[PDB]
Ligand binder design. Sequence first.
Ligand SMILES: Cn1[nH]c(=O)cc1Nc1ccccc1
Ligand SMILES: Cn1[nH]c(=O)cc1Nc1ccccc1
Ligand SMILES: Cn1[nH]c(=O)cc1Nc1ccccc1
Ligand SMILES: Cn1[nH]c(=O)cc1Nc1ccccc1
Ligand SMILES: [Zn+2]
Ligand SMILES: [Zn+2]
Ligand SMILES: [Zn+2]
Ligand SMILES: [Zn+2]
Lengths: 360, 360
Amino acid sequence: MASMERFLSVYDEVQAFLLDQLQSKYEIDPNRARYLRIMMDTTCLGGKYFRGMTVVNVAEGFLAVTQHDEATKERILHDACVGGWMIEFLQAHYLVEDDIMDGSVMRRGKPCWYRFPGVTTQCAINDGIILKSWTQIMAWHYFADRPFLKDLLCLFQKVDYATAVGQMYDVTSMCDSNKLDPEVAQPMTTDFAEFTPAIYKRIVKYKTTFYTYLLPLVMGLLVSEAAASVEMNLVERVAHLIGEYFQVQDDVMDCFTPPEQLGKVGTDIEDAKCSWLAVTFLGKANAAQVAEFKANYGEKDPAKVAVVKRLYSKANLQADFAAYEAEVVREVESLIEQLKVKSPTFAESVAVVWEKTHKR
Amino acid sequence: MASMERFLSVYDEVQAFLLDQLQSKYEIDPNRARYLRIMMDTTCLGGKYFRGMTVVNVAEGFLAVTQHDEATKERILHDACVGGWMIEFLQAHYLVEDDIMDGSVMRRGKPCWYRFPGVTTQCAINDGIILKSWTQIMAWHYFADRPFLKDLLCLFQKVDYATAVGQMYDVTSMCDSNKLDPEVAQPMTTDFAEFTPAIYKRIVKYKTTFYTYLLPLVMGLLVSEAAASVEMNLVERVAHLIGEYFQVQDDVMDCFTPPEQLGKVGTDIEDAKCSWLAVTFLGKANAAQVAEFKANYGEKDPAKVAVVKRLYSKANLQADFAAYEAEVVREVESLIEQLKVKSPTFAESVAVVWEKTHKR
Ligand SMILES: Cn1[nH]c(=O)cc1Nc1ccccc1
Ligand SMILES: Cn1[nH]c(=O)cc1Nc1ccccc1
Ligand SMILES: Cn1[nH]c(=O)cc1Nc1ccccc1
Ligand SMILES: Cn1[nH]c(=O)cc1Nc1ccccc1
Ligand SMILES: [Zn+2]
Ligand SMILES: [Zn+2]
Ligand SMILES: [Zn+2]
Ligand SMILES: [Zn+2]
């Protein structure tokens, strides 16, 4: 059975389990069950399933080199699919809530969930809470007797937390740290002194890399009972590196990819985000350019946004990106090589992860 | 050491642990650490700590009748305080998010968190996410080697889920079930056919009773290694009963307690909530009264809200409340008696829980 079909069948299984349990144990009625079914499909389906499928990929890698009964192979694959879905549902939680937080309009060419006419923010916040609770219901049901249950919950827990910490880092990235105060409305930074590579890296490391690359990799090891075949510090390092790279790409696209292609109208400039473009622009700009940046950034006014886009174009940031790219290639290759010492197989899964990110 | 002082010291300990771990492991800076410290205090402190203190109370009950080394008594009490804080932080999560969801103004005589000038909804949603992640960080750290860790996480998990399901039941309670559809903006019910005792009970059972009464009781049993001294079905029944009663009281107060006393301006009528007053009014009203209710309920207009308040006054709902109260007294006493069969001590903790609710 091909990986994607297995993964998608498990979605149907898991959905049916969750909705059946709401009827038998939580006194739900059919109309609310239908609402939740539609919520799950709309928020969890329709992406590329990169994260969930990485869990499946890692597990398949181990199966190819490990002796097992056929029933055991199927069990490990079912586990990897459920675990993949846990990550996809955790992402869905964060997308729902983030879209609300940011007042976002679209996501993947469709309205944000909260904007659906029969949803509203009042329900959507709670819907996003339910998305994440479903991750736990899945784990407790499908993995109840599994030897990796503890380590899987503890890891999941840490990644979730890191993610929420990263969201805080993100939404506060255009404030001056020394001015943060719940009592005082937060001015946008005037100096941009905190738009540095190191500050940027911290945002991205927590907000994206733990759930997008670390969790899928390590969950595939856990459901494979293979975490002792890897040096965990190398897994962390490679995950944080590829994940950073993934975000820089996302930041570039926000500014330069046509809205129809992107699935949304990017607003990083208007939102004054600490993006890779802004940090790298401020890293090479002259005094006059920095001044023109400060006068136009973080403003909804389209004339000012176009001034910022023009400043990025004239600044030839494509060249800084090529250079960053080349350095990421060196380091990712270095880590992959290091991972071969203890597990060729896992090194190869990381290679696959890298190819799917590198050239996308 | 008195229970409240122990409980409050543990708060300081747990806060310090969480903020220290954010500095040493999550790369946090001092200003964001301060923001989170202020968030925790503002959202978790200042209530009566009924829920957290119930865990401590149950545990103290067992200590009085069980042989242990002094160090063990202290360990069990420390555990009960951490576990109490887990519940208080879970409530804080839900209050933060619910206040946002409902567009609430005040809570306990202070502005809702999201309304603080340097917070905003964009941060507050995430803050509420962090509140709940902190429950898990506490459990994994303080209870890592504990024999009850599994059962405690699994229970916690189920209660959290039940709560989010109850929130869905609540926010959808003024819609016609058969009209729920994410594609279509939801009209308020015109018939009120779903304002029944049984539908009401389901809302309250999930939205409040699991986290307010069941979880504190059962967490006190778990940290005491005493869950085999009780019949769990009796614990559930008594928890659901007292919790229902607690909510009916809350519903009455929303309408009739002066705003300064309540800590907020109650808006159940304007929000068209399925309250105990509305269900009991519709249960005794004549045709003309029902018609006047339908014309005025669920409308911000103060003239219409005063018409609804007047209809409740003329309907002498105090008498239905006395009658309900008397029946709750019978049943709670019956369950307490039943609980004495296997544990006098735990029966007595439930009595204390009841006295603190009954006459408050
Ligand atoms: C363009 N420049 N050259 C490198 O080698 C790295 C960067 N910028 C960067 C800063 C923070 C995170 C990721 C990339
Ligand atoms: C201005 N130009 N037009 C596009 O479509 C993309 C870019 N520049 C770019 C910046 C950083 C990395 C890669 C490309
Ligand atoms: C007033 N009436 N008499 C009872 O004995 C109970 C109710 N009403 C009620 C309905 C749903 C939940 C809780 C109370
Ligand atoms: C109208 N009246 N004035 C108050 O202050 C309270 C009530 N009535 C009431 C309704 C149900 C239960 C208890 C009291
Ligand atoms: Zn965001
Ligand atoms: Zn982006
Ligand atoms: Zn609410
Ligand atoms: Zn209320």
